[PDB]
Amino acid sequence: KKTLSIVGASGYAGGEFLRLALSHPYLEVKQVTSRRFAGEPVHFVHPNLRGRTNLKFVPPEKLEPADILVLALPHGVFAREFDRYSALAPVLVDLSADFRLKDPELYRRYYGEHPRPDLLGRFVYAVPELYREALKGADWIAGAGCNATATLLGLYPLLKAGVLKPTPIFVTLLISTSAGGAEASPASHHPERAGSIRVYKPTGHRHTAEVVENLPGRPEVHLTAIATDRVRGILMTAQCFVQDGWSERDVWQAYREAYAGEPFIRLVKQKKGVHRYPDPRFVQGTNYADIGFELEEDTGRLVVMTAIDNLVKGTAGHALQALNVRMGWPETLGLDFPGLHP
Numbered sequence: 534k535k536t537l538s539i540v541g542a543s544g545y546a547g548g549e550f551l552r553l554a555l556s557h558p559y560l561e562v563k564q565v566t567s568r569r570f571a572g573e574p575v576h577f578v579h580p581n582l583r584g585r586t587n588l589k590f591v592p593p594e595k596l597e598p599a600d601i602l603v604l605a606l607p608h609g610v611f612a613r614e615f616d617r618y619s620a621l622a623p624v625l626v627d628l629s630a631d632f633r634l635k636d637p638e639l640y641r642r643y644y645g646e647h648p649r650p651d652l653l654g655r656f657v658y659a660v661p662e663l664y665r666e667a668l669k670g671a672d673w674i675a676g677a678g679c680n681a682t683a684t685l686l687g688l689y690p691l692l693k694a695g696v697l698k699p700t701p702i703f704v705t706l707l708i709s710t711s712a713g714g715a716e717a718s719p720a721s722h723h724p725e726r727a728g729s730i731r732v733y734k735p736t737g738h739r740h741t742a743e744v745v746e747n748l749p750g751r752p753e754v755h756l757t758a759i760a761t762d763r764v765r766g767i768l769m770t771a772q773c774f775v776q777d778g779w780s781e782r783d784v785w786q787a788y789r790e791a792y793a794g795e796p797f798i799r800l801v802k803q804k805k806g807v808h809r810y811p812d813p814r815f816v817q818g819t820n821y822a823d824i825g826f827e828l829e830e831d832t833g834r835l836v837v838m839t840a841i842d843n844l845v846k847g848t849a850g851h852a853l854q855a856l857n858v859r860m861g862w863p864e865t866l867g868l869d870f871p872g873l874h875p
Contacts (some may be wrong), residue, residue: 536563541606542565542575557853602621604618609644615648627673643739643742659854682841687826692749710726712760740758766841767843774835797821813842815874816840817842853868
């Protein structure tokens with residue numbers, strides 16, 4: 534049973550990890566930090582945790598060493614104060630984008646110059662379905678972007694098996710408002726925001742970098758993020774074309790091959806019934822990535838789909854799953870919630 538503390542636990546990413554860790558049998562949450570809510574019980578910020586823990590936020594200066602340290606700070610902050618936090622634990626799980634990329638110049642293009650460039654390539658990208666082996670020996674784990682996770686899981690098998698023609702792949706993601714974080718903005722005032730569909734980042738999305746670095750064979754991939762008013766969830770859709778000869782059966786085989794035995798991948802193969810395609814609503818609160826596709830026969834056009842809860846499978850859930858791998862614990866530990874219906 535290991536000790537684990539969370540930096541930036543008042544945010545959505547850290548708070549979601551806090552919820553998950555609290556019901557994990559082999560983890561003991563020691564400290565959770567917050568400058569703003571220092572001294573306040575955690576349920577003051579996360580009401581769902583009312584009566585489930587006596588933890589209170591402490592200022593980060595009060596931070597003591599622990600076995601595992603989860604960093605859920607605003608992007609760029611952990612990198613600027615790396616030495617201070619890295620000394621607190623041998624195992625680091627960073628949910629920020631600070632150490633996700635290998636190429637220092639790719640990082641700069643989307644985030645500006647990295648302060649500790651030689652550190653890039655040391656953290657292992659947290660996508661168990663792709664790097665489980667490397668995660669087993671990773672002391673520094675870098676969580677992946679939510680949209681990146683959805684896009685990579687849906688596309689990886691296809692590119693790995695050479696299913697797609699080399700032409701550009703267009704990824705349109707329907708995202709949620711929690712993806713924007715807990716910090717308010719004029720655009721987020723509820724009556725101003727509810728009901729709106731906000732084109733969010735139509736071009737130049739920073740998750741593109743993550744997607745390109747973790748897909749085989751230098752594929753051309755473009756992203757467009759459109760935010761609906763749902764609070765959680767992501768429906769990733771991708772437009773591309775299959776090489777000639779590929780039937781629907783073949784494409785499923787490509788997925789079965791890449792993800793055979795994956796505990797958190799569900800291939801949605803349904804010919805009939807009401808729920809035939811990945812739908813973020815049903816994976817809400819879960820660590821599942823539901824995957825499906827439809828092949829346009831006469832054109833060869835393939836529409837790929839992947840749905841996940843952006844805060845769980847897209848953030849805290851996959852980070853914990855990866856931590857389970859590193860620690861040698863069953864991957865589903867603390868991540869077995871099935872979701873609800875209706």
